[PDB]
Amino acid sequence: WTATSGSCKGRCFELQEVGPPDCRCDNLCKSYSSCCHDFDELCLKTARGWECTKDRCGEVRNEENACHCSEDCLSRGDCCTNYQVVCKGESHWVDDDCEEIKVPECPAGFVRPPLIIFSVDGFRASYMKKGSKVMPNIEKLRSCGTHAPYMRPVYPTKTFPNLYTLATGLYPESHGIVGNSMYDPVFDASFHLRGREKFNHRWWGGQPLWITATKQGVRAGTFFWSVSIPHERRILTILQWLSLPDNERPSVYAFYSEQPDFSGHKYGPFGPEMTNPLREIDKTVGQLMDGLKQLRLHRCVNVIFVGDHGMEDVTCDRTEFLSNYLTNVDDITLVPGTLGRIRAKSINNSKYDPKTIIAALTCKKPDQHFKPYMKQHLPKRLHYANNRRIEDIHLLVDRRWHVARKPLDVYKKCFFQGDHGFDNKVNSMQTVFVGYGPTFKYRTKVPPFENIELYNVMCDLLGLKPAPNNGTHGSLNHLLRTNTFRPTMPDEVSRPNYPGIMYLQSEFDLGCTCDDKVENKLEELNKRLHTKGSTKERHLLYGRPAVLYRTSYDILYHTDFESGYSEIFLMPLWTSYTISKQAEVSSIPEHLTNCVRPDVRVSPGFSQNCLAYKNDKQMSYGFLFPPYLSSSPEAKYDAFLVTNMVPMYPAFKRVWAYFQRVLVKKYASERNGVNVISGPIFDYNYDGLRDTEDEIKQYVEGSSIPVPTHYYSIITSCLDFTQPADKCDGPLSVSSFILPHRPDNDESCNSSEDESKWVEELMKMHTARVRDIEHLTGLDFYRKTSRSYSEILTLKTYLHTYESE
Ligand SMILES: *[C@@H]1O[C@H](CO)[C@@H](O[C@@H]2O[C@H](CO)[C@@H](O[C@@H]3O[C@H](CO[C@H]4O[C@H](CO)[C@@H](O)[C@H](O[C@H]5O[C@H](CO)[C@@H](O)[C@H](O)[C@@H]5O[C@H]5O[C@H](CO)[C@@H](O)[C@H](O)[C@@H]5O)[C@@H]4O)[C@@H](O)[C@H](O[C@H]4O[C@H](CO)[C@@H](O)[C@H](O)[C@@H]4O[C@H]4O[C@H](CO)[C@@H](O)[C@H](O)[C@@H]4O)[C@@H]3O)[C@H](O)[C@H]2NC(C)=O)[C@H](O)[C@H]1NC(C)=O
Ligand SMILES: NC(=O)N1CCCc2c(n(Cc3cccc(OC(F)(F)F)c3)c3ccccc23)C1
Ligand SMILES: [Ca+2]
Ligand SMILES: [Ca+2]
Ligand SMILES: [Cl-]
Ligand SMILES: [K+]
Ligand code: NA
Ligand SMILES: [Zn+2]
């Protein structure tokens, strides 16, 4: 209940919301049906519109006007944003040359440069170039400030997940806003775009920037605007707040525009109708910047212009229907559209079965435009599984498509021509970032980066300590002129052992065999040096990874590769090796096909055994350093050490063998040598973090050999490919992947074909950041380079996407 008979006099857009049933005058009061009776009259004035004209200059203040052109308006802080242009002969901000802002130039009493976040819904990255002729204010922010060619949103590429990701630095699985629509089975409640449930604070996890600022004594404008408040009034309200006394004035503000998204849905991302919405957004930016210039704040404020997601061409005719695949369609609930999430319609129906639903949805039609997944099997780069609000069954929908349950859903709900939500690597889903102000760099282009990184930087801009989040603090220091965050590398927690030869062959009873008993001081001293680390500088180019948790492990050196061998998991945590452009591929000689050799540096009790693999009818094994890339027939024996072996399903061995035999050499040719680090990942609770021993759900039958859920590789070379990977003087280049370790290749519809037709496509789907692998393994890479640590942090957040331009 609201007793709406109080008054908004002197309270318009008040910053602290008053409690029920007292009536509200804050920018959200309309959304709660709670404004005072006179809110419209007092707070939403419109008379005479939004611009001064020649004949209004010096007018007698009329308090009814939307904004003012009277002489006292500057010190009232309520002039129309074009006041000084129309009436005092000033230029528009956009018509001024840009001049580097080396220091904040702020009015007296400003403790810090304010931060204004100008967010645009559905602003696709390519609009910056394609709409540049009609967006001169935005183009000036872009060219004069710091900009990225695009910013990667989070998945799903919808509004609510992305804006709350911007606000918190968190993946949706962690912040809890995992779609625009959600069912939470613990609450037994639903979240929807329309309605009241979304206002309940139990949905919203982590700590958003406005709460972060308030807790640390930095005042925040309210970030939310009821939909009926026009853009011009939002801008004027911000400008009015910036005129408050020092003790009352916020330091951070947000503006939000529902455009261009609103129009993009109706007309598609490049519909001829899209020009006007782009012009109108630019005009709004112009009003803000003219308004700041009037207040002498245009070389004081840091402005961020940022989008939440792009927009793709999608029409009603490009809809797949689950009723064309499933017999039981009425026993499921689907969250539909540019992604699918399926759960049982009724929890009392014990005949519902996810295994048969997935199978009925797998590779059933030749050009099927969605792919079903158990959530834990989704590409790890999406970080979309660790939340009870994310249904076990997920459909990744092809760009340009929808999924729906039955045709009646699409016509008893063509309207739309645009939509978004798809995989966040899709070019059309990329969005925009520009930073302009004293704290950002001047005329600087930076590489694309993920929106999860921005919360940290917004905290840096305001002198706040960020709450714990998924950004990598420091990875965006190259955006900033000052206020950088200078992190130190994490300390290694476990130091390695360096075992020498400690065991005789006959102490091992592993059921392994090798045809290796074929008998020289020239080469005897040589093998010894290699086992002591003489080639290590060649194969371990960036220092050994640091182990950031408590465990027992050994460094093992070899001619062709170096490993960190875990005595706990009975396999390497990592295996590092370098392949030059010149390297040659050989085959596994016949007499060595089933060779596994005990490692006399490592106890039988800390070794895998061959008998377990013989006994386990489902599980085979592979090797981390590939025998195909051995430097010589003699070095090849090292590759068959039991300490280089890892458990692998036969179906996965197809993938792995193709990567090792064909792709590594291919990359070394193309990149001028590569350094490779490969290893296992265990993430049985799909939280994106390294499993402890007691979390492992599967072992090789009859043994303590844990089965990895994934295998990773980190592939590094010189950014200047005129230099070989092992003699690189400058910046590095990386690509990585986290391949799911699956007992079938059902994920790849063309897997009956030769690996050359499907494996690389699978690997590209499972592209990863080095950082993703760090979380999954508890390792810290690139500890020893000649590069600055912030530059290494940027490299560790890089994702190779394989999208075209
Ligand atoms: C991305 O960044 C984020 C932020 O850093 C990373 O997430 C953190 O990861 C930590 C490890 O998983 C986790 O730390 C745990 O904290 C638990 C207390 O959590 C509450 O308090 C914090 C602080 O304010 C709060 O943020 C939490 O918020 C979560 O839950 C609420 C309510 O449900 C949601 O609204 C909110 O969105 C958020 O949900 C997300 O996280 C939870 C996990 O906490 C998931 O379940 C959700 O799906 C969702 O993703 C909480 O309100 C604390 O209980 C934990 O302690 C356990 O382990 C320690 C070892 O240190 C030990 O002392 C105890 O034994 C204890 O175990 C006990 O509980 C077990 C489970 O019931 C049980 O098995 C045992 O027997 C024990 O009884 C733990 O320390 C931290 O909370 C999150 N933070 C956030 C915001 O998500 C994330 O990892 C990063 N991702 C990547 C890939 O890097
Ligand atoms: N009516 C409205 O005001 N909005 C439209 C509805 C969806 C929405 C808005 N905001 C607030 C917001 C505005 C501008 C930037 C921003 O992000 C930043 F905090 F990072 F700056 C956040 C949200 C924050 C979290 C989740 C959903 C939303 C806005
Ligand atoms: Ca949006
Ligand atoms: Ca885990
Ligand atoms: Cl959704
Ligand atoms: K087997
Ligand atoms: Na297949
Ligand atoms: Zn939209």
Swiss-Prot record:
Co-factor note (free text): Binds 2 Zn(2+) ions per subunit.
Residues spanned by motif Cell attachment site: 76-78
Residues of the SMB domain: 4-47, 48-92
Active site: 159
Intrachain S-S bonds: 8-25, 12-43, 23-36, 29-35, 52-69, 57-87, 67-80, 73-79, 98-144, 106-300, 316-414, 363-749, 512-610, 514-595, 718-728
Modification comment: N-glycosylation, but not furin-cleavage, plays a critical role on secretion and on lysoPLD activity.
Activity regulation note: Inhibited by vanadate. Inhibited by micromolar levels of bile salts, such as tauroursodeoxycholate. Not inhibited by taurodeoxycholate. Not inhibited by hydroxysterols, such as 7-hydroxycholesterol, testosterone, dexamethasone and prednisolone. Inhibited by EDTA and EGTA.
Tissue expression as described in the entry: Abundantly expressed in cerebrum and cerebellum. Localized in secretory epithelial cells in the brain and the eye including choroid plexus epithelial cells, ciliary epithelial cells, iris pigment epithelial cells, and retinal pigment cells.
UniProt-annotated binding residues for 1-tetradecanoyl-sn-glycerol 3-phosphate: 159, 180, 261, 420
Gene Ontology MF terms: alkylglycerophosphoethanolamine phosphodiesterase activity; calcium ion binding; lysophospholipase activity; nucleic acid binding; phosphodiesterase I activity; phospholipase D activity; polysaccharide binding; scavenger receptor activity
Binding site for Zn(2+) 2: 261, 265, 420
Pfam families (alphabetical): Endonuclease_NS (PF01223), Phosphodiest (PF01663), Somatomedin_B (PF01033)
First-level EC class: hydrolase
Chain positions recorded as 1-(9Z-octadecenoyl)-sn-glycero-3-phosphate binding sites: 159, 180, 261, 420
UniProt-listed Gene3D superfamilies: 4.10.410.20, Alkaline Phosphatase, subunit A, Extracellular Endonuclease, subunit A
Consequence when changing residue 159 to S: 15% of wild-type lysophospholipase D activity
Site (described: Essential for catalytic activity): 796
Alphabetized InterPro entries for the sequence: Alkaline_phosphatase_core_sf, DNA/RNA_non-sp_Endonuclease_sf, Endo_G_ENPP1-like_dom, ENPP1-3/EXOG-like_nuc-like, His-Me_finger_sf, Phosphodiest/P_Trfase, SMB_chordata, Somatomedin_B-like_dom_sf
Function comment: Secreted lysophospholipase D that hydrolyzes lysophospholipids to produce the signaling molecule lysophosphatidic acid (LPA) in extracellular fluids. Its major substrate is lysophosphatidylcholine. Can also act on sphingosylphosphorylcholine producing sphingosine-1-phosphate, a modulator of cell motility. Can hydrolyze, in vitro, bis-pNPP, to some extent pNP-TMP, and barely ATP. Involved in several motility-related processes such as angiogenesis and neurite outgrowth. Acts as an angiogenic factor by stimulating migration of smooth muscle cells and microtubule formation.
Domain notes: The nuclease-like domain is most probably catalytically inactive as residues that are essential for catalysis in the DNA/RNA non-specific endonucleases are not conserved. However, it is required for the stability of the protein and the catalytic activity born by the Phosphodiesterase domain.
PANTHER family assigned: ECTONUCLEOTIDE PYROPHOSPHATASE/PHOSPHODIESTERASE, ECTONUCLEOTIDE PYROPHOSPHATASE_PHOSPHODIESTERASE FAMILY MEMBER 2
Protein name: Autotaxin
Source organism of this protein record: Rattus norvegicus
